[PDB]
mmCIF file of N, CA and C in Angstrom:
data_model
loop_
_atom_site.group_PDB
_atom_site.id
_atom_site.type_symbol
_atom_site.label_atom_id
_atom_site.label_comp_id
_atom_site.label_asym_id
_atom_site.label_seq_id
_atom_site.Cartn_x
_atom_site.Cartn_y
_atom_site.Cartn_z
ATOM 1 N N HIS A 1 0.847 -1.206 0.000
ATOM 2 C CA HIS A 1 0.000 0.000 0.000
ATOM 3 C C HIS A 1 0.874 1.245 0.000
ATOM 4 N N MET A 2 2.129 1.066 0.402
ATOM 5 C CA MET A 2 3.038 2.181 0.615
ATOM 6 C C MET A 2 4.212 2.106 -0.359
ATOM 7 N N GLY A 3 4.731 3.278 -0.711
ATOM 8 C CA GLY A 3 5.721 3.395 -1.773
ATOM 9 C C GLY A 3 5.652 4.778 -2.413
ATOM 10 N N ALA A 4 6.750 5.515 -2.292
ATOM 11 C CA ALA A 4 6.927 6.760 -3.032
ATOM 12 C C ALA A 4 8.321 7.331 -2.781
ATOM 13 N N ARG A 5 8.801 7.131 -1.556
ATOM 14 C CA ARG A 5 10.131 7.578 -1.176
ATOM 15 C C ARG A 5 10.213 9.101 -1.211
ATOM 16 N N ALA A 6 10.059 9.703 -0.036
ATOM 17 C CA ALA A 6 10.073 11.153 0.091
ATOM 18 C C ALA A 6 8.937 11.770 -0.717
ATOM 19 N N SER A 7 9.175 11.892 -2.024
ATOM 20 C CA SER A 7 8.235 12.596 -2.894
ATOM 21 C C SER A 7 8.341 12.060 -4.318
ATOM 22 N N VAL A 8 7.732 12.786 -5.250
ATOM 23 C CA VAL A 8 8.020 12.620 -6.671
ATOM 24 C C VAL A 8 9.492 12.931 -6.948
ATOM 25 N N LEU A 9 9.863 14.187 -6.716
ATOM 26 C CA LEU A 9 11.077 14.755 -7.284
ATOM 27 C C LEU A 9 12.295 14.350 -6.450
ATOM 28 N N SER A 10 13.430 14.970 -6.761
ATOM 29 C CA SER A 10 14.556 15.027 -5.832
ATOM 30 C C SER A 10 14.533 16.352 -5.069
ATOM 31 N N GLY A 11 15.618 16.603 -4.344
ATOM 32 C CA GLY A 11 15.860 17.903 -3.735
ATOM 33 C C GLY A 11 15.943 18.986 -4.807
ATOM 34 N N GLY A 12 16.803 18.738 -5.793
ATOM 35 C CA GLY A 12 17.033 19.698 -6.862
ATOM 36 C C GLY A 12 15.746 19.950 -7.640
ATOM 37 N N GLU A 13 15.154 18.866 -8.130
ATOM 38 C CA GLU A 13 14.059 18.950 -9.086
ATOM 39 C C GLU A 13 12.831 19.578 -8.430
ATOM 40 N N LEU A 14 12.806 19.536 -7.102
ATOM 41 C CA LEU A 14 11.920 20.383 -6.315
ATOM 42 C C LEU A 14 12.238 21.858 -6.574
ATOM 43 N N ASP A 15 13.463 22.237 -6.226
ATOM 44 C CA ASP A 15 13.851 23.638 -6.158
ATOM 45 C C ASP A 15 13.699 24.298 -7.528
ATOM 46 N N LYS A 16 13.632 23.461 -8.557
ATOM 47 C CA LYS A 16 13.250 23.903 -9.890
ATOM 48 C C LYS A 16 11.737 23.798 -10.070
ATOM 49 N N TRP A 17 11.156 22.815 -9.386
ATOM 50 C CA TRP A 17 9.719 22.603 -9.414
ATOM 51 C C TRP A 17 8.993 23.705 -8.653
ATOM 52 N N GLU A 18 9.757 24.490 -7.893
ATOM 53 C CA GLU A 18 9.163 25.326 -6.849
ATOM 54 C C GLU A 18 8.904 26.734 -7.374
ATOM 55 N N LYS A 19 8.587 26.824 -8.660
ATOM 56 C CA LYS A 19 7.902 27.992 -9.211
ATOM 57 C C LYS A 19 7.716 27.825 -10.716
ATOM 58 N N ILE A 20 6.812 26.902 -11.069
ATOM 59 C CA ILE A 20 6.384 26.799 -12.471
ATOM 60 C C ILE A 20 5.084 27.561 -12.667
ATOM 61 N N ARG A 21 5.200 28.726 -13.299
ATOM 62 C CA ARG A 21 4.067 29.619 -13.479
ATOM 63 C C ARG A 21 2.968 28.936 -14.288
ATOM 64 N N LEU A 22 1.760 28.965 -13.733
ATOM 65 C CA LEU A 22 0.641 28.213 -14.275
ATOM 66 C C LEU A 22 0.273 28.733 -15.664
ATOM 67 N N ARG A 23 -0.016 30.030 -15.724
ATOM 68 C CA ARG A 23 -0.600 30.639 -16.905
ATOM 69 C C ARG A 23 0.196 31.905 -17.287
ATOM 70 N N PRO A 24 0.342 32.109 -18.612
ATOM 71 C CA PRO A 24 1.009 33.318 -19.159
ATOM 72 C C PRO A 24 0.390 34.627 -18.683
ATOM 73 N N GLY A 25 0.705 34.987 -17.443
ATOM 74 C CA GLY A 25 0.328 36.285 -16.901
ATOM 75 C C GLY A 25 -0.828 36.137 -15.917
ATOM 76 N N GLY A 26 -1.003 34.916 -15.425
ATOM 77 C CA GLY A 26 -1.901 34.653 -14.308
ATOM 78 C C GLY A 26 -1.193 34.890 -12.985
ATOM 79 N N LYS A 27 0.120 35.092 -13.066
ATOM 80 C CA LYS A 27 0.951 35.433 -11.934
ATOM 81 C C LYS A 27 1.327 34.196 -11.123
ATOM 82 N N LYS A 28 0.304 33.487 -10.661
ATOM 83 C CA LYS A 28 0.472 32.435 -9.670
ATOM 84 C C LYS A 28 1.361 31.322 -10.219
ATOM 85 N N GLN A 29 2.051 30.640 -9.311
ATOM 86 C CA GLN A 29 3.151 29.760 -9.681
ATOM 87 C C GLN A 29 2.932 28.364 -9.097
ATOM 88 N N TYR A 30 3.394 27.368 -9.856
ATOM 89 C CA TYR A 30 3.427 25.995 -9.393
ATOM 90 C C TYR A 30 4.334 25.894 -8.138
ATOM 91 N N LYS A 31 3.868 25.018 -7.241
ATOM 92 C CA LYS A 31 4.674 24.518 -6.143
ATOM 93 C C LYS A 31 4.504 23.009 -5.998
ATOM 94 N N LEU A 32 5.315 22.434 -5.117
ATOM 95 C CA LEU A 32 5.264 21.001 -4.854
ATOM 96 C C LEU A 32 3.905 20.634 -4.252
ATOM 97 N N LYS A 33 3.251 21.649 -3.695
ATOM 98 C CA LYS A 33 1.879 21.518 -3.228
ATOM 99 C C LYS A 33 0.955 21.156 -4.387
ATOM 100 N N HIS A 34 1.345 21.599 -5.583
ATOM 101 C CA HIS A 34 0.513 21.416 -6.762
ATOM 102 C C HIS A 34 0.888 20.127 -7.489
ATOM 103 N N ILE A 35 2.156 19.745 -7.350
ATOM 104 C CA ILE A 35 2.600 18.412 -7.735
ATOM 105 C C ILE A 35 1.866 17.361 -6.893
ATOM 106 N N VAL A 36 1.868 17.632 -5.584
ATOM 107 C CA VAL A 36 1.372 16.673 -4.606
ATOM 108 C C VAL A 36 -0.119 16.407 -4.860
ATOM 109 N N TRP A 37 -0.794 17.468 -5.296
ATOM 110 C CA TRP A 37 -2.120 17.368 -5.891
ATOM 111 C C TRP A 37 -2.079 16.462 -7.126
ATOM 112 N N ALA A 38 -1.185 16.838 -8.043
ATOM 113 C CA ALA A 38 -1.134 16.252 -9.372
ATOM 114 C C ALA A 38 -0.906 14.736 -9.270
ATOM 115 N N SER A 39 0.241 14.401 -8.678
ATOM 116 C CA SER A 39 0.596 13.015 -8.431
ATOM 117 C C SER A 39 -0.434 12.352 -7.516
ATOM 118 N N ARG A 40 -1.229 13.186 -6.850
ATOM 119 C CA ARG A 40 -2.478 12.739 -6.244
ATOM 120 C C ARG A 40 -3.462 12.310 -7.336
ATOM 121 N N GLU A 41 -3.970 13.310 -8.052
ATOM 122 C CA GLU A 41 -5.091 13.123 -8.958
ATOM 123 C C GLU A 41 -4.737 12.107 -10.041
ATOM 124 N N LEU A 42 -3.448 12.059 -10.373
ATOM 125 C CA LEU A 42 -2.925 11.020 -11.245
ATOM 126 C C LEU A 42 -3.106 9.645 -10.588
ATOM 127 N N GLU A 43 -2.285 9.417 -9.565
ATOM 128 C CA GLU A 43 -2.110 8.093 -8.984
ATOM 129 C C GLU A 43 -3.455 7.563 -8.474
ATOM 130 N N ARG A 44 -4.369 8.521 -8.264
ATOM 131 C CA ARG A 44 -5.698 8.198 -7.770
ATOM 132 C C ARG A 44 -6.716 8.179 -8.905
ATOM 133 N N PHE A 45 -6.309 8.686 -10.063
ATOM 134 C CA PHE A 45 -6.988 8.374 -11.321
ATOM 135 C C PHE A 45 -6.912 6.874 -11.595
ATOM 136 N N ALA A 46 -5.681 6.385 -11.759
ATOM 137 C CA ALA A 46 -5.476 5.058 -12.339
ATOM 138 C C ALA A 46 -3.998 4.676 -12.275
ATOM 139 N N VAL A 47 -3.233 5.453 -11.513
ATOM 140 C CA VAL A 47 -1.789 5.553 -11.717
ATOM 141 C C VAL A 47 -1.046 5.211 -10.434
ATOM 142 N N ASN A 48 0.273 5.094 -10.550
ATOM 143 C CA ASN A 48 1.138 4.889 -9.404
ATOM 144 C C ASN A 48 2.142 6.063 -9.297
ATOM 145 N N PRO A 49 2.319 6.532 -8.042
ATOM 146 C CA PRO A 49 2.999 7.819 -7.747
ATOM 147 C C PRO A 49 4.480 7.824 -8.106
ATOM 148 N N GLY A 50 5.168 6.804 -7.592
ATOM 149 C CA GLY A 50 6.583 6.608 -7.923
ATOM 150 C C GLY A 50 6.706 6.207 -9.388
ATOM 151 N N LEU A 51 5.633 5.596 -9.884
ATOM 152 C CA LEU A 51 5.481 5.325 -11.314
ATOM 153 C C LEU A 51 5.512 6.648 -12.093
ATOM 154 N N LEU A 52 5.114 7.705 -11.349
ATOM 155 C CA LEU A 52 5.047 9.031 -11.966
ATOM 156 C C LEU A 52 6.226 9.893 -11.540
ATOM 157 N N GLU A 53 7.023 9.373 -10.605
ATOM 158 C CA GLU A 53 8.398 9.811 -10.403
ATOM 159 C C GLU A 53 9.194 9.628 -11.706
ATOM 160 N N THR A 54 8.943 8.489 -12.343
ATOM 161 C CA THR A 54 9.849 8.022 -13.407
ATOM 162 C C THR A 54 9.295 8.385 -14.767
ATOM 163 N N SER A 55 10.169 8.877 -15.643
ATOM 164 C CA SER A 55 9.810 9.268 -16.987
ATOM 165 C C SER A 55 9.126 8.121 -17.738
ATOM 166 N N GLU A 56 9.373 6.906 -17.242
ATOM 167 C CA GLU A 56 8.739 5.726 -17.811
ATOM 168 C C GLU A 56 7.236 5.745 -17.522
ATOM 169 N N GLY A 57 6.919 6.045 -16.262
ATOM 170 C CA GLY A 57 5.529 6.131 -15.834
ATOM 171 C C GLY A 57 4.889 7.415 -16.348
ATOM 172 N N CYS A 58 5.613 8.517 -16.181
ATOM 173 C CA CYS A 58 5.129 9.827 -16.581
ATOM 174 C C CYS A 58 4.862 9.849 -18.094
ATOM 175 N N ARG A 59 5.514 8.889 -18.763
ATOM 176 C CA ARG A 59 5.254 8.625 -20.169
ATOM 177 C C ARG A 59 3.980 7.785 -20.320
ATOM 178 N N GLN A 60 3.940 6.719 -19.508
ATOM 179 C CA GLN A 60 2.833 5.770 -19.571
ATOM 180 C C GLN A 60 1.523 6.493 -19.203
ATOM 181 N N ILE A 61 1.717 7.626 -18.515
ATOM 182 C CA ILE A 61 0.632 8.559 -18.264
ATOM 183 C C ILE A 61 0.441 9.502 -19.440
ATOM 184 N N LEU A 62 1.467 10.299 -19.728
ATOM 185 C CA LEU A 62 1.330 11.413 -20.654
ATOM 186 C C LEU A 62 0.918 10.896 -22.044
ATOM 187 N N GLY A 63 1.117 9.587 -22.211
ATOM 188 C CA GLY A 63 0.627 8.876 -23.378
ATOM 189 C C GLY A 63 -0.855 8.557 -23.239
ATOM 190 N N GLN A 64 -1.184 7.821 -22.184
ATOM 191 C CA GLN A 64 -2.553 7.424 -21.908
ATOM 192 C C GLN A 64 -3.445 8.646 -21.687
ATOM 193 N N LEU A 65 -2.820 9.789 -21.427
ATOM 194 C CA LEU A 65 -3.470 10.879 -20.695
ATOM 195 C C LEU A 65 -3.884 11.981 -21.665
ATOM 196 N N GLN A 66 -3.050 12.167 -22.693
ATOM 197 C CA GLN A 66 -3.288 13.192 -23.693
ATOM 198 C C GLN A 66 -4.641 12.919 -24.407
ATOM 199 N N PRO A 67 -4.768 11.672 -24.905
ATOM 200 C CA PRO A 67 -6.085 11.081 -25.265
ATOM 201 C C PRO A 67 -7.130 11.214 -24.162
ATOM 202 N N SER A 68 -6.751 10.762 -22.968
ATOM 203 C CA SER A 68 -7.698 10.584 -21.883
ATOM 204 C C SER A 68 -8.118 11.918 -21.283
ATOM 205 N N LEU A 69 -7.573 12.993 -21.843
ATOM 206 C CA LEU A 69 -7.929 14.340 -21.423
ATOM 207 C C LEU A 69 -9.285 14.736 -22.013
ATOM 208 N N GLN A 70 -9.517 14.260 -23.235
ATOM 209 C CA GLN A 70 -10.820 14.381 -23.872
ATOM 210 C C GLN A 70 -11.874 13.623 -23.072
ATOM 211 N N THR A 71 -11.401 12.737 -22.201
ATOM 212 C CA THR A 71 -12.274 11.775 -21.539
ATOM 213 C C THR A 71 -12.326 12.041 -20.038
ATOM 214 N N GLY A 72 -11.349 12.793 -19.554
ATOM 215 C CA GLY A 72 -11.041 12.848 -18.129
ATOM 216 C C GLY A 72 -11.656 14.104 -17.512
ATOM 217 N N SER A 73 -10.957 15.222 -17.722
ATOM 218 C CA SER A 73 -11.389 16.505 -17.191
ATOM 219 C C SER A 73 -10.405 17.605 -17.608
ATOM 220 N N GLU A 74 -10.890 18.841 -17.558
ATOM 221 C CA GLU A 74 -10.027 20.015 -17.553
ATOM 222 C C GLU A 74 -9.105 19.986 -16.333
ATOM 223 N N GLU A 75 -9.476 19.123 -15.381
ATOM 224 C CA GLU A 75 -8.695 18.949 -14.169
ATOM 225 C C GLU A 75 -7.776 17.734 -14.282
ATOM 226 N N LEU A 76 -7.992 16.938 -15.327
ATOM 227 C CA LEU A 76 -6.949 16.065 -15.855
ATOM 228 C C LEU A 76 -5.914 16.899 -16.623
ATOM 229 N N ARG A 77 -6.400 18.018 -17.156
ATOM 230 C CA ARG A 77 -5.592 18.864 -18.020
ATOM 231 C C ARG A 77 -4.566 19.639 -17.192
ATOM 232 N N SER A 78 -4.972 19.993 -15.976
ATOM 233 C CA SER A 78 -4.039 20.410 -14.937
ATOM 234 C C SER A 78 -3.174 19.230 -14.499
ATOM 235 N N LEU A 79 -3.803 18.061 -14.448
ATOM 236 C CA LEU A 79 -3.092 16.809 -14.232
ATOM 237 C C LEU A 79 -2.086 16.568 -15.353
ATOM 238 N N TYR A 80 -2.435 17.071 -16.538
ATOM 239 C CA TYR A 80 -1.633 16.816 -17.730
ATOM 240 C C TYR A 80 -0.441 17.774 -17.767
ATOM 241 N N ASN A 81 -0.769 19.063 -17.780
ATOM 242 C CA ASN A 81 0.220 20.109 -17.989
ATOM 243 C C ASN A 81 1.276 20.070 -16.885
ATOM 244 N N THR A 82 0.844 19.573 -15.725
ATOM 245 C CA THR A 82 1.727 19.479 -14.567
ATOM 246 C C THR A 82 2.450 18.133 -14.567
ATOM 247 N N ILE A 83 1.861 17.180 -15.281
ATOM 248 C CA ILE A 83 2.548 15.934 -15.625
ATOM 249 C C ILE A 83 3.626 16.204 -16.658
ATOM 250 N N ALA A 84 3.280 17.012 -17.661
ATOM 251 C CA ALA A 84 4.168 17.242 -18.790
ATOM 252 C C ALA A 84 5.332 18.150 -18.376
ATOM 253 N N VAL A 85 5.123 18.887 -17.285
ATOM 254 C CA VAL A 85 6.228 19.432 -16.502
ATOM 255 C C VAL A 85 7.072 18.282 -15.941
ATOM 256 N N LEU A 86 6.453 17.521 -15.039
ATOM 257 C CA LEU A 86 7.170 16.585 -14.191
ATOM 258 C C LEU A 86 7.900 15.544 -15.056
ATOM 259 N N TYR A 87 7.400 15.434 -16.290
ATOM 260 C CA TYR A 87 8.111 14.746 -17.355
ATOM 261 C C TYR A 87 9.279 15.582 -17.858
ATOM 262 N N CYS A 88 9.022 16.871 -18.041
ATOM 263 C CA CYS A 88 10.041 17.818 -18.472
ATOM 264 C C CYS A 88 11.203 17.834 -17.467
ATOM 265 N N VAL A 89 10.829 17.587 -16.208
ATOM 266 C CA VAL A 89 11.800 17.633 -15.120
ATOM 267 C C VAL A 89 12.586 16.323 -15.071
ATOM 268 N N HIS A 90 11.837 15.219 -15.081
ATOM 269 C CA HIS A 90 12.436 13.908 -14.882
ATOM 270 C C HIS A 90 13.415 13.592 -16.011
ATOM 271 N N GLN A 91 13.063 14.066 -17.203
ATOM 272 C CA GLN A 91 13.909 13.879 -18.375
ATOM 273 C C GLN A 91 15.260 14.562 -18.166
ATOM 274 N N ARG A 92 15.189 15.877 -17.978
ATOM 275 C CA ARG A 92 16.349 16.747 -18.036
ATOM 276 C C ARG A 92 15.879 18.217 -17.978
ATOM 277 N N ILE A 93 14.860 18.465 -18.807
ATOM 278 C CA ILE A 93 14.392 19.824 -19.055
ATOM 279 C C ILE A 93 13.873 20.441 -17.763
ATOM 280 N N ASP A 94 14.143 21.734 -17.584
ATOM 281 C CA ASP A 94 13.410 22.515 -16.593
ATOM 282 C C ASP A 94 12.636 23.641 -17.269
ATOM 283 N N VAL A 95 11.587 24.096 -16.574
ATOM 284 C CA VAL A 95 10.641 25.026 -17.200
ATOM 285 C C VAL A 95 10.260 26.129 -16.223
ATOM 286 N N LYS A 96 9.453 27.064 -16.727
ATOM 287 C CA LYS A 96 9.197 28.322 -16.047
ATOM 288 C C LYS A 96 7.704 28.654 -16.101
ATOM 289 N N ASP A 97 7.090 28.334 -17.233
ATOM 290 C CA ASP A 97 5.638 28.093 -17.278
ATOM 291 C C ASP A 97 5.394 26.627 -17.615
ATOM 292 N N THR A 98 4.176 26.170 -17.331
ATOM 293 C CA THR A 98 3.763 24.824 -17.675
ATOM 294 C C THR A 98 3.746 24.642 -19.198
ATOM 295 N N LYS A 99 3.039 25.567 -19.851
ATOM 296 C CA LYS A 99 2.862 25.509 -21.294
ATOM 297 C C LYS A 99 4.214 25.599 -22.001
ATOM 298 N N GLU A 100 5.172 26.202 -21.300
ATOM 299 C CA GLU A 100 6.560 26.209 -21.732
ATOM 300 C C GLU A 100 7.134 24.792 -21.703
ATOM 301 N N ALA A 101 6.837 24.087 -20.614
ATOM 302 C CA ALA A 101 7.116 22.662 -20.515
ATOM 303 C C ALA A 101 6.359 21.900 -21.605
ATOM 304 N N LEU A 102 5.061 22.191 -21.688
ATOM 305 C CA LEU A 102 4.188 21.491 -22.614
ATOM 306 C C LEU A 102 4.517 21.841 -24.057
ATOM 307 N N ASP A 103 5.428 22.794 -24.227
ATOM 308 C CA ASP A 103 5.983 23.092 -25.537
ATOM 309 C C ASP A 103 7.119 22.115 -25.862
ATOM 310 N N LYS A 104 8.013 21.964 -24.881
ATOM 311 C CA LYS A 104 9.027 20.924 -24.908
ATOM 312 C C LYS A 104 8.372 19.541 -24.990
ATOM 313 N N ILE A 105 7.235 19.427 -24.292
ATOM 314 C CA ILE A 105 6.631 18.105 -24.097
ATOM 315 C C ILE A 105 5.663 17.799 -25.233
ATOM 316 N N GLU A 106 5.180 18.864 -25.871
ATOM 317 C CA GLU A 106 4.487 18.766 -27.145
ATOM 318 C C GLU A 106 5.426 18.235 -28.224
ATOM 319 N N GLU A 107 6.707 18.551 -28.062
ATOM 320 C CA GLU A 107 7.715 18.213 -29.058
ATOM 321 C C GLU A 107 8.359 16.876 -28.732
ATOM 322 N N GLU A 108 7.589 16.019 -28.057
ATOM 323 C CA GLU A 108 8.113 14.758 -27.545
ATOM 324 C C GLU A 108 9.260 15.011 -26.571
ATOM 325 N N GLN A 109 9.369 16.270 -26.145
ATOM 326 C CA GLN A 109 10.294 16.625 -25.072
ATOM 327 C C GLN A 109 11.730 16.323 -25.490
ATOM 328 N N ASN A 110 11.933 16.227 -26.800
ATOM 329 C CA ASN A 110 13.269 16.271 -27.384
ATOM 330 C C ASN A 110 13.285 17.185 -28.603
ATOM 331 N N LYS A 111 12.415 16.877 -29.560
ATOM 332 C CA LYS A 111 12.390 17.582 -30.832
ATOM 333 C C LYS A 111 11.314 16.997 -31.746
ATOM 334 N N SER A 112 11.347 17.436 -33.003
ATOM 335 C CA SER A 112 10.553 16.842 -34.062
ATOM 336 C C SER A 112 9.069 17.148 -33.861
ATOM 337 N N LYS A 113 8.480 17.782 -34.871
ATOM 338 C CA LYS A 113 7.031 17.875 -34.990
ATOM 339 C C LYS A 113 6.654 18.703 -36.216
ATOM 340 N N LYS A 114 5.560 18.309 -36.859
ATOM 341 C CA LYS A 114 5.229 18.805 -38.189
ATOM 342 C C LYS A 114 3.840 19.431 -38.197
ATOM 343 N N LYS A 115 2.825 18.576 -38.258
ATOM 344 C CA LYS A 115 1.460 19.017 -38.510
ATOM 345 C C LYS A 115 1.348 19.641 -39.897
ATOM 346 N N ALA A 116 0.110 19.837 -40.338
ATOM 347 C CA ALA A 116 -0.171 20.653 -41.512
ATOM 348 C C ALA A 116 -1.643 21.053 -41.541
ATOM 349 N N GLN A 117 -2.470 20.152 -42.058
ATOM 350 C CA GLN A 117 -3.867 20.454 -42.335
ATOM 351 C C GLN A 117 -3.978 21.485 -43.454
ATOM 352 N N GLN A 118 -5.201 21.662 -43.946
ATOM 353 C CA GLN A 118 -5.522 22.771 -44.833
ATOM 354 C C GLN A 118 -7.025 23.031 -44.837
ATOM 355 N N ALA A 119 -7.725 22.309 -45.705
ATOM 356 C CA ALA A 119 -9.114 22.615 -46.025
ATOM 357 C C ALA A 119 -9.222 24.004 -46.645
ATOM 358 N N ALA A 120 -10.338 24.233 -47.334
ATOM 359 C CA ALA A 120 -10.636 25.549 -47.884
ATOM 360 C C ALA A 120 -12.028 25.551 -48.522
ATOM 361 N N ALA A 121 -12.963 26.193 -47.828
ATOM 362 C CA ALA A 121 -14.232 26.598 -48.417
ATOM 363 C C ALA A 121 -15.038 25.378 -48.845
ATOM 364 N N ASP A 122 -16.361 25.528 -48.820
ATOM 365 C CA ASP A 122 -17.253 24.536 -49.406
ATOM 366 C C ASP A 122 -18.695 25.034 -49.371
ATOM 367 N N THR A 123 -19.106 25.666 -50.465
ATOM 368 C CA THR A 123 -20.506 25.993 -50.690
ATOM 369 C C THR A 123 -20.680 26.695 -52.033
ATOM 370 N N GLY A 124 -21.937 26.944 -52.387
ATOM 371 C CA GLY A 124 -22.267 27.835 -53.491
ATOM 372 C C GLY A 124 -23.066 27.091 -54.556
ATOM 373 N N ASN A 125 -24.349 27.427 -54.646
ATOM 374 C CA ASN A 125 -25.185 26.997 -55.757
ATOM 375 C C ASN A 125 -26.565 27.644 -55.664
ATOM 376 N N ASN A 126 -26.923 28.375 -56.714
ATOM 377 C CA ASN A 126 -28.299 28.806 -56.924
ATOM 378 C C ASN A 126 -28.726 29.774 -55.824
ATOM 379 N N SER A 127 -29.014 31.006 -56.229
ATOM 380 C CA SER A 127 -29.674 31.972 -55.363
ATOM 381 C C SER A 127 -29.928 33.275 -56.114
ATOM 382 N N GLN A 128 -30.299 33.133 -57.384
ATOM 383 C CA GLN A 128 -30.460 34.286 -58.261
ATOM 384 C C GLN A 128 -31.684 34.109 -59.154
ATOM 385 N N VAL A 129 -31.870 35.065 -60.057
ATOM 386 C CA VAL A 129 -33.090 35.153 -60.848
ATOM 387 C C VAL A 129 -32.852 35.994 -62.101
ATOM 388 N N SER A 130 -33.740 35.831 -63.073
ATOM 389 C CA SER A 130 -33.534 36.379 -64.406
ATOM 390 C C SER A 130 -34.669 37.329 -64.772
ATOM 391 N N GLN A 131 -35.827 37.093 -64.165
ATOM 392 C CA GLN A 131 -37.049 37.790 -64.539
ATOM 393 C C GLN A 131 -37.523 37.333 -65.916
ATOM 394 N N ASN A 132 -36.884 37.875 -66.947
ATOM 395 C CA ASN A 132 -37.360 37.726 -68.316
ATOM 396 C C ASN A 132 -36.781 36.462 -68.944
ATOM 397 N N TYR A 133 -36.997 36.324 -70.246
ATOM 398 C CA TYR A 133 -36.704 35.083 -70.951
ATOM 399 C C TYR A 133 -35.209 34.782 -70.897
#
């Protein structure tokens, strides 16, 4: 029933964890209090905490979770963005906003990404008149 060892992070990864700004100009900042929530809502979603210590687990989450955000909650999304931090941390990367992390973490937290899409317009037929012959 027990297992986590101190916390998620290390000493260091805390002291970097100890001010990840939530939103671009919302002022307020991440703390380990918010991790402790996160690794809460995670591990109590379906997950294991020390499992989320490790980039292996934080992957097994951030994989299952990105999809499962459509299914989970906007509060999974806090679970997500703060996961994608704690992934950013466990890997190597440190961050300053979450979405900054989720930028690294959007990029598979190493590199590489494309996307495209296009589409363009679709309508038009009949809506006029001639009167005469």
